[PDB]
Amino acid sequence: GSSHHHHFQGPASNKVYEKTGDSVIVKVQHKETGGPRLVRLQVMGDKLIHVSATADSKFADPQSLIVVPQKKQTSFAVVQNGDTITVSTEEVKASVLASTGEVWFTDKNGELILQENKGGGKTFTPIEVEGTKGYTVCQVFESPEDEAFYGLGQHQADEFNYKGKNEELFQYNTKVSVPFVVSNKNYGILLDSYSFCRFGNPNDYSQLNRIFKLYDKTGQEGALTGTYVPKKGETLVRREDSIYFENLKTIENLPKKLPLMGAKVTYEGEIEPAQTGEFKFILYYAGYVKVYLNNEPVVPERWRTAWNPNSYKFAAHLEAGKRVPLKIEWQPDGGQSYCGLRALTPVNPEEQGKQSWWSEMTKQLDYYFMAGENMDDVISGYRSLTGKSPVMPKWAMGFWQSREKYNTQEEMLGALKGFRDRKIPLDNIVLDWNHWPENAWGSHEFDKARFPDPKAMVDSIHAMHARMMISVWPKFYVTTEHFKEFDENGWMYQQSVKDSLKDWVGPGYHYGFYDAYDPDARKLFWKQMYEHYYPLGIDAWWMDASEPNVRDCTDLEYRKALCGPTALGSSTEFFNAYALMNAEAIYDGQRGVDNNKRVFLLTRSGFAGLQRYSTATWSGDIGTRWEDMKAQISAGLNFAMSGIPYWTMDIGGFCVENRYVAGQKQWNATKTENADYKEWRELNTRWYQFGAFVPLYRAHGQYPFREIWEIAPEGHPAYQSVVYYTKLRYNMMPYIYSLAGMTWFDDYTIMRPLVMDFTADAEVNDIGDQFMFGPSFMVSPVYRYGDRSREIYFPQAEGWYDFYSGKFQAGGERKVIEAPYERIPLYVRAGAIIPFGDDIQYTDEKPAEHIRLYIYQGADGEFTLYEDEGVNYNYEQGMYAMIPMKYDEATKTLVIGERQGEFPGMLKERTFTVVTVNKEKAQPFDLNAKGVTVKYNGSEQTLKL
Ligand code: NI
């Protein structure tokens, strides 16, 4: 007979399933090769289900690094009905088939939310690394044609809406992976894996010679042609097997006696596929690069510096057996540089549209399903499971000025005094790397020739009502006492030491990175910061290189060798979570010393759960490029949808084109602006406009200097515009800090793609170049040089108002909108209630005694004004105040609600001026606008407008 035919309180091994206190474990009845043997549904909350699966006959159940203990027990029922076993909470029903182990999720009325690949979507393949064992796992779900996906972290290919798309999940300077996706069907999936993972296609890309017949410039099969024109000397022409010069090993395949700086290289020929469909390409690049395929400019010019390269993707339909031309034009722009092109063969759209996860190494499959009423409610599930985001200190919501690098104490203090003397508001100033004696990275001591009195410096920063952040890497020179403390305990990764790697500083120094996965190493790492930096009064920690970035431009295999073994297992298994571990070290470290003082970290990598450690990510060493500016909009919106609500970027870009440096040097010498310097000023103007509406507003990068008065002088349009937006950030502070309060109290998200608030309007699904800043402002950056307008789509809504003029704009249409040099297009949603305060030089310079409450009429609205002490965790004990406000359009009524809570230093009495904007009343933004004066003492008042 068949395989099935042959094989209340009895042992569970006799039963198809076993119910425990919070879960059901089902034994797969029709076992397949590579398939699951056990599938568990564990109830974590009313809307929260933990799915586990394994090929073994028991679960390994390792402790999660990302999921925290939950607050309450959750009631649920289980029903077995033939092959179907269903776990039901008040809000969701999760079902599994005993036959296959396939899972699906419905709402309380049985409406489908998410279904596993029909017949099962889980595959297990054994893997062994360094005597440890686990599985490579695939999990695939069905996905309808109208499903849209957001999240995965922060990637640099300008992709937006991951439906039908691919992404590799590893960590590298500018690329932050978070294994969490949110759907427009109002659920999220969190994959609990720490290894290299993939969303979409589970395979690596292929070199061009593996998937195409190649013909060179003369038509000879078997290669492309490479033509190398050096800056000086004879041109070299050779055949190329493959275009793959992507890491330190493979750049040795470029021509041996041909200097790349100032060279112009052309790769060309024809490619011929053996199957028909959409081929998906990936370009890896540094220097200047363009790509043409079939005579189309598929990659218009991009640039990176020779040493932080990037990836960019494109796709094209190709016909089997037809030759099409391919040309890559490349200016390496350095002695070392990178260029590679790879591709994936076509995947049937029925399969490519599915939601597919691949994970290189875990002990079992673990994922979390979270349902919601809307996308904010999905994010709330993520915050329940991986921890709430604390309210950032209020000062973190102001302007941050940084540099790579302030070289001396005088330089740093001079920059800060420069803001105060010009009445350009600012809260935070940042000291970068190499403030230590050159040969002593990791000593945490200051070079006293350049910083003669570090404590006096921090005291002076504080006396000017500013806050200081300092750079701290996980990197230690081998000669330092601090290195030796880690090393003697086995807590330093050895590969970089064994291989005698030298860094880039001076003559080159030997170094290593500490193992953040070891809990005692974390304590020591914090203790060294506590003994050397904390007594100076430093307020914030810039935790750079937390990928960990042990060695730039190394291949996957060697990156794994460089960052393990770890305390928990191999680096193959524990590959992506370093920044989470490193952030725990500092957050739990500092609250251990002083539990009331707020913590701030800014870190270069990230992972699921990062937000629970009061830690933001910045988007890393990006270029001074319009295309990089555009990519940060989509990167930021995906990062926000990954559950982590504090994020920032280097306004202006980090690595600088040589022509911009030359422009600045010319300005310094002659006060004349060349064409490149004109572009520098416009790039920075537009990028500051954009940055004023991201969660943390921060300028940073390499030379030129980035203080606004260095970019352009007083009176120049660039200076005028940037100062306008820096001031506006502070007039918006009552609104902005209310959003910060909401991150903790309401599990809120600050920088929001349009799909969050306008999910019902599918025209927003692919829009990754506009966004909402809190509930009320729609921001549409200009990201092309010379443009004085741009196309904007206005979501379906009762209406929109131009912020600057108050002029009405209908919802549900796309049009060309004016965007002068000095202005970013900025609209306000009908129903907005927005509190604006007076000019201040820094957060809480003065109490917000007089607030203008702007009411943008035409729809109902709500807003809660949140205030607290700003600098400590007293809000956790109920020391804060909320003033809820509600506006009813039908009766034109505003209620300023009874104040809830109090705290030390709170205004008991204050003033509101209520200002209306409506379709018949185009009121420009104006602090002095005419309105209704309200003297408020905490008691409810009602206004009929
Ligand atoms: Ni020490």
Residue numbers in the entry: 1 to 7, 17 to 954
Paper excerpt:
In this context, we recently reported the characterization of a novel xyloglucan utilization locus (XyGUL) that confers Bacteroides ovatus, and species harbouring syntenic XyGULs, with the ability to utilize this abundant vegetable polysaccharide across sampled human populations. Here, we present the three-dimensional structures of BoGH31, BoGH43A, BoGH43B and BoGH3B, expanding our knowledge of the structural determinants required for xyloglucan degradation. Our analyses highlight key adaptations in these enzymes that confer their specificity for xyloglucan oligosaccharides, while also providing a rationale for the maintenance of two divergent genes coding for GH3 enzymes, and similarly two divergent genes for GH43 family members, within the same PUL. While we were unable to determine a structure for BoGH3A, our structural and sequence analysis of BoGH3B has also allowed us to highlight further potential differences between these two enzymes encoded by the operon. Together with existing biochemical data, our analyses of the three-dimensional structures, and various enzyme-inhibitor complexes, of BoGH31, BoGH43A, BoGH43B and BoGH3B provide molecular-level insight into the stepwise breakdown of xyloglucan by the BoXyGUL.
Within XyGULs, GH31 α-xylosidases play an essential role removing xylose from the non-reducing end of processed xyloglucan oligosaccharides. Indeed, deletion of the gene encoding GH31 from the XyGUL completely abrogates the ability of B. ovatus to grow on XyG and XyGOs. Consistent with this role, the GH31 α-xylosidase present within the Bo XyGUL (BoGH31) has been shown to be highly active against native XyGO substrates (XXXG and XLLG, nomenclature according to), rather than disaccharide-configured activity probes, such as Xyl-α-PNP, despite the presence of optimized chemical leaving groups requiring little protonic assistance from the enzyme. Crystals of BoGH31 were obtained by hanging drop vapour diffusion (19°C) using 0.2 M potassium thiocyanate, 14–20% (w/v) PEG-3350 as mother liquor and were used for subsequent structure determination. However, by far the closest structural match to BoGH31 was CjXyl31A (Z score = 33.1, with RMSD = 1.15 Å across 888 matched Cα positions). As observed for CjXyl31A, BoGH31 presents with an extensive, modular structure featuring several accessory domains appended to a well-conserved TIM barrel-like structure (for a full description of terms and domain nomenclature see). The catalytic core of BoGH31 is composed of residues 384 to 758, which form the central (β/α)8 (TIM) barrel fold and harbour the active site (discussed below). The domains decorating the central catalytic unit include an N-terminal β-sandwich domain formed by residues 16 to 213 with additional strands contributed by residues 363 to 383 when the peptide chain returns from a PA14 domain (residues 214 to 362).
